[PDB]
Design a protein around this ligand. Sequence first.
Ligand SMILES: COCCOC[C@@H](C)OC[C@H](C)N
Ligand SMILES: [Cl-]
Ligand SMILES: [Cl-]
Length: 347
Amino acid sequence: QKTLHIYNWTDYIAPDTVANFEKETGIKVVYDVFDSNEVLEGKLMAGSTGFDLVVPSASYLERQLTAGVFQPLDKSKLPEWKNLDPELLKLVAKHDPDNKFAMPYMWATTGIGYNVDKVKAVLGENAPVDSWDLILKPENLEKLKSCGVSFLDDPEEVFATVLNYLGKDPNSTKADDYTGPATDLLLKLRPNIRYFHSSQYINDLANGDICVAIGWAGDVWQASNRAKEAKNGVNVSFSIPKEGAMAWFDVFAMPADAKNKDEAYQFLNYLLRPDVVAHISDHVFYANANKAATPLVSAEVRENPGIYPPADVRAKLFTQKVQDPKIDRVRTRAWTKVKSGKLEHHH
Ligand SMILES: COCCOC[C@@H](C)OC[C@H](C)N
Ligand SMILES: [Cl-]
Ligand SMILES: [Cl-]
């Protein structure tokens, strides 16, 4: 009797995927969840995670490759590997050369989730919902404060978005960009931000408790769908803003010390079945990386340009770079200062 341990993002599988795999294979699954790349990386670098499969973003897989925390995937144990789109594989390979360590899972963008009606009530019918101005212009956040503003608790995402908005390289390697203009803007915004959190914003958007959030696309579409299902009269939408946004792939990987590799390959091959991953996309409102699955994904998901954006929008997307340790120090210190920003001092 074997037991497979999986560590995935919250809100990132269909409700019946694991039970269906358990029923089919007889394998018992222990499924645990996270909402932060930094939490997962800390576990991978601190000791044994005890997990057989983990799901980093691709730039987090990249940065940990030479640490040897992952073992290469034996493709002979993944006969359904050919269902993955081979062009998407080439893009993922920028982070994982020759696709040796990672199985692409889902792809999306980091944009703005918002309450359509409350934004228009507060900012007017002309509210700049197609722009990062909605959430990064202080004059707008000051007005939105009471209806509730959330930022992701993701320093890399937040600084890269701010840098881009300020007309800098979103992956700037210049320390002064972080300590100066990016920090200046974030401190100006900070009094109007209710919280930094990377998962509470889904239900808060759905229930009308947060009016604007920096959010991951399919999480915001899940909020929208939860409100629709609740018949609660809340209208949530998502914007990939006109100034561009971050795009990313999340990938399954196998820790080098995984106990139950055979069961792990069984689960990956299960996810490679087109019906399995299409059903996941239908529930989580994210694009998968499986070419064979695409015709099976629901029309509502496939036809949503905030899930499958067209070429003119894709042209404005950027990807995360791994920063050197001096930028990492500057950025992380600045993030701690920003998040503590409301506190009173006596110096
Ligand atoms: C099936 O995933 C949606 C397609 O993803 C779009 C991004 C990842 O690719 C860019 C290239 C140009 N197509
Ligand atoms: Cl990524
Ligand atoms: Cl359909």
